[PDB]
Ligand code: HEM
Ligand code: HEM
Ligand SMILES: Cc1cc(N)nc2cc(-c3ccc(CCN)cc3)ccc12
Ligand SMILES: Cc1cc(N)nc2cc(-c3ccc(CCN)cc3)ccc12
Ligand SMILES: C[C@H](O)[C@H](O)[C@H]1CNc2nc(N)[nH]c(=O)c2N1
Ligand SMILES: C[C@H](O)[C@H](O)[C@H]1CNc2nc(N)[nH]c(=O)c2N1
């Protein structure tokens with residue numbers, strides 16, 4: 001079966017066959033679409049088919065399908081599963097798997113870069129202190145003094161689910177949020193719950209508006225431990241505006257390195273529950289979502305006031321005007337400090353090129369329109385008019401429940 | 412099977428049961444989501460009629476009543492006899508109002524129950540069609556105090572006698588090609604503008620030329636009709652702060668009246684059913700003016716604002732887009748023509764969603780089309796999970812007439 005997608009702005013039509021190689025479910029049925037729903041222990045029984053599928057993928061990509069090297073690897077993995085109940089990936093397979101998990105991330109607009117991922121093998125790690133050292137080196141490598149480099153660090157895989165490696169932070173670098181007694185919030189409201197956990201674990205909070213949170217790290221199923229990222233490793237950009245000299249007086253800054261640390265990496269049936277990864281920001285992630293979401297820093301009105309906008313009715317689009325100025329300021333600040341950032345026009349244009357390339361060379365590119373389209377100025381970017389197909393390929397990055405809900409506390 | 416939708420801005424959770432009443436199919440499977448794809452006899456007719464009449468008589472609390480059973484019997488007889496059936500006026504109004512209520516792509520559904528339905532099923536000719544359409548335009552326009560309306564022409568019989576309005580909207584600006592290169596007028600309508608001249612029209616080859624109507628009655632060849640100019644309410648577009656904005660020479664019409672969809676009720680098909688409401692500001696300023704495949708005056712506005720168009724990272728396209736949209740709302744408001752901005756409409760839709768979950772058990776909603784084409788995440792619909800499913804009565808797409816019409 002073949003499936004066509006149409007770009008309505010250029011009439012380019014593309015044909016997807018890669019969706020046939022899809023395995024997992026989407027949540028949709030023939031009678032309901034859950035395309036806008038945010039989020040819609042494993043035995044030897046089902047593991048070797050999952051391994052064999054991955055290994056067939058891997059050796060196809062290295063043009064060794066059906067080789068002796070291929071069959072011997074299958075046989076070796078077979079004996080390892082039946083004997084030890086799991087198996088280990090070779091370094092080659094792990095690198096391939098992590099790159100293809102990003103390549104298959106249907107919600108990621110930055111996947112033109114998928115093949116330039118630096119993979120850090122931390123599968124020899126055994127303790128929370130060892131995890132912190134690996135994460136510090138990831139942060140330093142990835143940051144590269146503002147010339148950001150994509151990277152992933154991979155901690156040991158799940159075994160019986162009772163010994164997981166977990167990073168309890170959702171991102172490696174994030175600002176604390178503090179609920180005040182008067183109902184207001186100091187800092188980042190998205191991080192109030194995590195901040196409270198950290199304080200409960202003994203973190204001495206500075207209680208400022210831009211406090212970098214400590215790392216809460218869990219090795220081999222033990223209780224998590226706090227570590228402070230050395231401040232010299234946390235690159236930050238003060239936010240100023242190219243025309244408005246009062247914008248600096250807002251006292252805003254952001255960190256340069258987006259590094260998501262709460263997702264699960266799946267490769268050949270193995271589950272890597274601790275696998276922080278990082279790229280560089282698209283400007284709107286900071287300027288639209290991190291600053292102007294009602295449930296975040298919510299500086300729209302303060303910017304709108306300082307601009308002396310008509311804030312009396314929404315039809316003055318004072319909210320839209322303030323939003324664009326904030327996003328100009330975020331991009332100006334980052335470029336001025338020579339810290340890698342991409343605007344949402346450049347990023348979506350590149351993604352369209354990536355997508356067309358993927359259709360030609362790979363026969364498809366799974367893509368989640370609901371997430372690919374930028375959160376402002378959607379239709380003046382070229383992804384808005386691009387039909388997309390969403391389906392789940394493996395290797396993949398998956399969601400996982402927050403560890404404080406599932407962890408069994410030692411004490 | 413009793414599904415949940417979360418709003419991530421407020422944590423409000425709603426439980427959907429209405430989807431279990433979904434009949435048609437979505438295009439998605441458990442292996443692939445197609446949520447971003449734009450497009451999808453005597454037997455099956457009586458179950459269709461029964462399901463619809465069961466809906467209708469429940470809504471008036473007459474389910475399993477004398478009137479209900481007799482009507483089902485009456486319709487069943489007329490189907491066995493005539494192979495089709497006719498809707499009572501009350502059923503026709505209900506079916507039309509619920510087709511809008513079910514339109515998962517429509518952000519303006521909070522108004523669904525206040526739809527003025529014009530029964531045009533006695534129409535027999537394109538001249539009659541033109542008359543009914545003129546009365547529709549004047550009623551809906553209402554000197555700028557716009558009123559929602561639908562006019563329903565005779566239902567399809569055997570596909571040979573279809574009533575069709577060939578325009579995609581009752582009021583749209585012409586689109587002419589070029590010996591030069593690109594396009595004068597509206598590029599969206601280039602093909603239709605051809606099939607007007609190629610069908611007889613005399614184009615004034617300007618930029619804001621209101622297209623004639625191309626009306627097809629009882630499956631005959633379509634006929635050209637010019638909509639009386641004094642019924643086409645238009646708004647000159649100025650900006651409340653830029654006075655070179657007027658020099659751009661822009662205007663738009665006040666009445667959005669979509670005329671190419673098909674209205675399905677109780678199995679019956681109405682191929683000509685033009686319906687109208689009033690604009691959300693972004694439909695004109697974001698899409699009609701700024702899409703590359705449309706008027707595309709973005710590059711020209713930004714020049715006039717002396718913005719740095721050398722790098723995309725200056726966000727000049729974004730700054731200009733906002734100003735164009737401020738000007739569209741300003742113009743319509745100044746001329747006392749009904750318009751809604753995308754913040755108010757999406758806020759209204761969240762309240763409508765909450766009402767539908769409360770009093771109906773759900774609301775089919777297409778996030779890809781509900782979220783506005785600018786400033787998406789500062790509107791409340793962005794953070795609202797939606798469930799998309801196809802209820803009936805419904806509005807549906809239909810093929811373009813010229814690709815079908817046995818000439
Ligand atoms: C290199 C620059 C990159 C850019 C500019 C970029 C951009 C983005 C953006 C804007 C999102 C949407 C997040 C949101 O707005 O809430 C996203 C999602 C995502 N990105 Fe990328 N990304 C980059 C690199 C990477 C890398 C290196 C990985 C993994 C190795 C990755 C994996 C993902 C995944 C899995 C998601 C989906 C998360 C989810 O399902 O919630 N990205 N990306
Ligand atoms: C009264 C004010 C109304 C507003 C503000 C409104 C708003 C909108 C908007 C913004 C869209 C997206 C369309 C696009 O982007 O091209 C839409 C779609 C739609 N509207 Fe409404 N609308 C209104 C009235 C109505 C009425 C009266 C009907 C039917 C009786 C209707 C039926 C539809 C349908 C069927 C669609 C989707 C068409 C498709 O699937 O392509 N609307 N509406
Ligand atoms: C690697 C990478 C780079 C980047 N610029 N943004 C990301 C954004 C995400 C992401 C962050 C948060 C969320 C949910 C909250 N918006 C979903 C996805 C994950 C990874 C990213
Ligand atoms: C009744 C009504 C009012 C309004 N403000 N916009 C509409 C917009 C549409 C609409 C028209 C055309 C299309 C084609 C897809 N771009 C999609 C939706 C239909 C009816 C509308
Ligand atoms: C409910 C809705 O799906 C949810 O708010 C999604 C929409 N699209 C998104 N797109 C991006 N890039 N990031 C997001 O957090 C979201 N949130
Ligand atoms: C490709 C994509 O499905 C297409 O551009 C859709 C997306 N969302 C839309 N949303 C609205 N309201 N109107 C549209 O025309 C579209 N176009």
Ligand SMILES: [Zn+2]
Nearest residue numbers: 028033439444
């Ligand atoms: Zn779907």
